[PDB]
Subunit: 497 residues, 4 copies
């Protein structure tokens, strides 16, 4: 469906105007299902990014949005939520066109996105600070929460609009001015949400959209002196660089990098549930969702049976066009990403692991032109291997065995990451013991994947800094100010007269 | 009084043992009043720092402190507070010996320190997380707050034990394990507080003290993979380096880097109060306290009179030995710091400002051997000058005029810093308008200097990242985990059978 | 006429619009002309019992109480949207029923929308706490649940606004409710129940009882299946309700109005203070719960203030609330106008001066309605009954004071504690006074503001508990401490 | 005849404490305090008058209005509350012995109590300066909106005979931490530890009138404490009948009430419970403090497949419970509190019989020589009963348990909730998921999963339904002693011009 695109903007949005790149450069956007060019958009310059940042500062300083009532900001955020639902069908199709995920996955996404905006809309006017009981007589002490200021927001290619919603909603609810740059390879739904936000109506410069991967654009967004918070979701290497650049101005950072999310299955788990959720954990969005569970840890007494049950089902996963109802798994996002996955299979082999199923591009005629990769299970591996220690971010799972509860915890925590993970067991007490010991921002007990606006999401260790979603997510966009009034000021007379 | 030192430890404290440096290196500690060597301590190695970090990790993982009840942690933090009060006299004298500040200032410090530990002791068991209303039927969602983990803590020379208290108290209250390194030039009260903490009794490895050059062990304390939070208070250049190092492991950072704190005096201020508090803001601890007000902004109609009234009083400030009750202002901290202050006077002159009073080392016989510098007032300057834009951190103030409320706000915000500031005016409504527009973490209305454990302290912009003190200060030492239990788990059956 | 042509005339119990069990009815009056405008069911005590039992059944079924908080919020938001959609007709109905101006009713409907919206947004924002247990190997959590079955009795001043303050949190939290509006002003409440039915809630979640039938109030306050009784109205009725609630140790929330003081210092903005004294005294003919009937004015400006106030009072335009030029409508009922008249007799007997007003207006177009002239009473003091007792009408008293300390002492010399104002350009002084006033809401250089984001309620005899804000929501929740011992060991205290 | 235990009462005050002075009753009336172990008079104290209570209330109001305590910094109030806590620990031994002397409970139970009481004061000391209100994001442009929390004002506090000093600590600690002024009246039959804690509080030092102690059950004293116009909150713990009367009196001034009236606390034992744990905890639930603690579990609901075995195991152990002097280390259960209370328990056994229940064991006063003079009653198990009986529907507050069977999870929940009460209860099952389902459906302020009795200052305690109004302990408990004030400042006030000029 190209007609989606006939009225879609191809430009950046800076200081209230849809504008081309300063040098008129463009980029061709691809559909991963067939590798065909589907759209062409502006490829911005570092100067365009600077300009958007300066526009955001100007707007912030003008106070039109930062001084708007929180109730009114909430209404405007709610109007965005309603736009998302109104345009659910076209937004879902656009996300499927751009990212390759199934239309059913995109629908679920748009429902979630609506709920993200709705949550933050409702939160906007619920906490402006606190009154402090001052330990000094005849003083009044209060903490006032203000918008952090100017924020730069960089989003990834896995769930572009969802990740955008997680950043935009609190930023707008709190009164910040923002500059957003989506992944250079998946900008379509982000352009669309900016059109919608423009329709809702915000003061000029409050929201700005930069497009591309232009030289130093990232560096400007992370290193500009007028930025108060840089919020980045993406690769670990890029994130570290971003944090180093933010240091030059002592700028707050929020990072969500990925993680190797463990899926711990005890022998007293509901076996069929555990297999089902291992599949779901490994292969939803071809294993590219941030919540993906690529590291299965299964108790030794059920390991052999578990491995086979998993493989039996992996063999039946239906690959195809995300627009087709029968498709269960779409393609991976890009050539570069598929190549990384292929190199990892080589690593697995070199280390002596077994490719139990999958591990190559599918041959089928209707899959030949797209960026498909078979769902894969790697067995006979251990925590010392690169394939276990490094996240591939593809439709690939590893399987390790464990003997004891203590061992499962130790193995699961033997990782540089700390994003999310699950424990499966009918023994809820045991599951809760494991959950309390796992160094992960989210632990699921007898589930896999859930996240929602009402609860914070983020990582321990190298999976990130800070939180998105929930009240903690909103707090990344606020800054505290202690105003202390002396209501009966007297000279101190410490120095001589 | 060097009997204060006859049983003071000269060693580091690592994994429950007082130990020398791995290479037996030492450093001579000086009294700034007379530049005499007063004590010799171990000068630790980068391997000593690594060892302390590994000990903190081991202890953390053992759970003896991290899994102790919050109530019990609070009792132990309270026992520290009680030790501080019990040893108030000797601790105050030690701080005066090491830092040069007056004994009265040290006494006030020790009272404050007691109150910091007491506040956090009381906070320890007041919030373990929250229950979330899950949007998914048949699920329980909770957010549990855990200690962040292993923390490294680097403190400055201005208020060594105070700054230590701000970091140690929440770290211990929340169940973290810590490695602390005080300023290489002022370690004495920090050594002493470690002896006191050891007496209170903590599991081995919970607290560790490293001594010596930040240039040796700093990179390890900021860049080690087993650290979960690096908390640094000190110079801006060092802080940026520390944050860039922390990025290598995506490590949380908390920074307080000082600031050029404005003191805004309107023509309807209580005049005598404003002069008094300008003196206090400029010259308490020879202008070296983090709350110092070096940038005075005074309304033009009272400026000429204000300048003279300030100068009249500056001429009478009594410099001397901090142990002498008549002393109002002690020396500055070191040769290096005094040299920086002298270079700044040269800058002021080169830029065309006037040294209205002071601006040199005092001549008097009893002051000749110490690191004294005269309280100084610089006039005829403006916001474009280096002397206005750069913080000297000494007994020096600049005076700028302003015509309007709007101008005062614009000038005060024309700075890279954002730590604290004051507004003086009998028109409380106007003071509140100004306070709301100042980009500062603390604004005082008709006061100067107050800070206290009940309220968060920290900076906007280049003054820092995060907060110390208050509930927010405690929160730096916690991490959130969302535990989601599915209480009626069903297969999803997204994939084929 | 078409405004009422499709409006239900019945009660709403367990998902059905029903007549009274005895088919009794009550004629509803328009205070502007005293004409009967509508006829509705006058329920029985058995009807009230049946609604309470229906609410309990629904609560126990869990369809609403176990609905997700996010979904409950969407439903409460849908109510808010209905209010805005029907803003025009709802405003006209409130004016018809209560007599207040159409402009006042419009403002009301905008506010009511915002009340539902606020609570919709709050519904899913706090489910309880994790506690750091002092017992090793235990998990301690506090789960917040709906309080249960709630009865809600509302007054005649701002019927739909007061209904919104109660309904919004009750629904957001998952309670089941039984509401009874003032017998004399049920129209907008019937309408909002039609709208809520359209939004769609499980049968029994919401129920509407109409009337002042024998023992109906007593059933709503004294039934064993009720978990909270929330009442807004007169002090005498509130006390009776609390005594009845005691028979089952039932939570009560009460809002009983108050003598709200308006303190004007000589350094106030003078014209602002006169303007706001008028607004405080005479908005809704002085019948709004935020009304300021007790003016305390500093002696040095008192004479000038009194005359400025009187000059303006003489020009206040009385008339039909539907007419744009009307500034003040009639009072609510014959009984209420009679209470106001008896208070003027008291004022005279005590030796106060009726400086202006104090009687029914004569004008031809006003003759048939329940009008009472805006009134200013001067030369009075805190020892008088007129100053100690609130009349809740278009009447203000004026007392002088010399000092800040005296103003505070006078303002606190009252059984009430609902709201009040301080007018002064000296903000530090206004803040000192505000901190010392025993009132749930204090305005500095303003009069009347209230809003869903902040709690409203009274100290002393003005009430128990709060409505609006997070505290208001909390009246509809109950805390449960669930403590799990994760390594239970025998205690072995008793011998084996 | 002298013995070292006399040092315990020799210097203990016998008077009330009003407006900073230890004073006798206005009419010099006194009351004899008894030790329930031997029914001997152990001490004589003032029995105050209604005028004494009025005077204390007026003193509290005066003090509150003076602001010396209400305007003290929260930090400083916390230090003072902490000093009280430290006094409790310092005098732990004597306070425990005194509580055992006055109430009859074992010395080990009193020791545990004093540790708890210390922790209560410590918890509130720590809480005192942690929340002064909120800044509100105002929907009106050019306004500032804040909520300031103030002490509620003058509070009256009436405590029961079961855990006199513990219940006193639950009330005093938040009242002082928040800056209220208080008037406290302990149970007329158990005032000793309350007098002692007032001596200790006076040592710590508070402004005159901030704390006041009334003693007795004098005519209309209760009525003055619940119905006086100068009171802002009445907090009562005790019987349901008294609580209702108190609430009705509080209504005359529209006065806030906080009530804790006890309850019939269910102990639900599934067939997949740890059997020996469940029998152990059923004993603990039924018989700690002779079943007089407020957390007592008198209503056992046991799944039918293990009911017979459970009933016999319970009875086998009940036969071995050691009754005796609370001061003796071997004592497992002490006497009941008074003659009137023991009589109520005896009349309930008559009711049980009339209704057709079986007294499986106990049900009478013990015969043994060393128990003959005290207010002892045998630990009792009543079987073959059902939810329609008075003995199941009404709480006896003694060393008595009833045992009902149930077949299903749904049935257990239904039966457990078929009660006018709502204080606390337990679920025993190795199936934690099931226990959690049951816990969420029970209409009780506290639910224990595989435990019985725990309460602590960090978590609120209170009842649904007729067990009470409001909460004690935790942040919610502190909040009973605070009142909210919304201060709204218009920072750019403009005339409205609604009325014509
Ligand atoms: Na991290
Ligand atoms: Na300085
Ligand atoms: Na910063
Ligand atoms: Na009125
Ligand atoms: Na009240
Ligand atoms: Na109740």
């Amino acid at each position: 469906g190209m007609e989606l695109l006939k009225h879609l903007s191809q430009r950046q949005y800076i200081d209230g105007e849809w504008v081309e790149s300063a040098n008129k450069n463009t980029r061709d956007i691809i559909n991963p299902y067939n590798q065909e060019v589907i759209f062409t958009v502006s490829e911005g310059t570092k100067e365009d990014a600077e300009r958007a940042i300066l526009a955001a500062r100007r707007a912030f300083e003008s106070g039109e949005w930062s001084q708007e009532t929180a109730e009114t900001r909430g209404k405007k955020v709610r109007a965005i939520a309603d736009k998302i639902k109104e345009h659910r069908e076209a937004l879902a199709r656009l996300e499927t066109l751009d990212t390759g995920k199934t239309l059913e996955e995109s629908y679920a996404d748009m429902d979630d996105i609506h709920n993200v905006f709705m949550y933050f809309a409702g939160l906007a006017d619920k906490d402006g600070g606190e009154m402090i009981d001052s330990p000094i007589p005849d003083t009044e002490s209060k903490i006032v929460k203000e918008p952090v200021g100017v924020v730069t927001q960089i989003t990834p290619w896995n769930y572009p609009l969802l990740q955008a919603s997680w950043k935009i909603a609190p930023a707008l609810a709190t009164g910040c001015s923002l500059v957003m740059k989506p992944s250079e390879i998946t900008p379509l739904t982000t352009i669309r949400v900016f059109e919608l936000m423009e329709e809702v109506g915000f003061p000029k410069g409050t929201i700005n959209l930069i497009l591309g991967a232009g030289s130093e654009v990232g560096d400007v967004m992370s290193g500009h002196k007028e930025v108060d918070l840089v919020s980045f979701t993406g690769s670990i290497e890029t994130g570290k660089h971003i944090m180093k650049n933010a240091a030059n101005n002592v700028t707050n950072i929020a990072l969500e990098l990925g993680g190797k999310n463990p899926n711990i299955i005890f022998d007293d788990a509901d076996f069929e549930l555990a297999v089902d959720q291992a599949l779901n954990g490994g292969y939803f969005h071809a294993g590219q969702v941030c919540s993906a569970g690529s590291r299965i840890l299964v108790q030794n007494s059920i390991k052999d049976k578990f491995e086979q049950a998993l493989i039996d089902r992996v063999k039946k996963i239906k690959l195809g066009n995300g627009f087709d109802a029968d498709t269960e798994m779409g393609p991976v996002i890009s050539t570069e990403h598929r190549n990384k996955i292929e190199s990892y299979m080589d690593v697995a082999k070199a280390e002596g692991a077994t490719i139990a199923v999958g591990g190559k591009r599918p041959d089928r005629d209707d899959l030949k032109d797209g960026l498909f990769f078979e769902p894969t299970v790697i067995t006979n591996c251990d925590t010392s291997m690169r394939i276990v220690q490094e996240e591939v971010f593809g439709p690939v799972v590893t399987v390790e065995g464990f003997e004891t509860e203590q061992e499962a915890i130790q193995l699961a925590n033997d990782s540089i990451y700390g994003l999310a993970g699950a424990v499966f067991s009918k023994d809820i007490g045991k599951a809760q013991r494991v959950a309390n010991k796992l160094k992960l921002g989210t632990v699921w007990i007898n589930d896999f994947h859930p996240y929602f606006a009402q609860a914070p999401w983020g990582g321990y260790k190298q999976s990130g800094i800070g939180r998105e979603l929930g009240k903690e997510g909103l707090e990344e966009y606020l800054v505290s100010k202690h105003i202390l009034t002396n209501t009966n000021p007297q000279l101190v007379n410490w120095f001589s007269k």
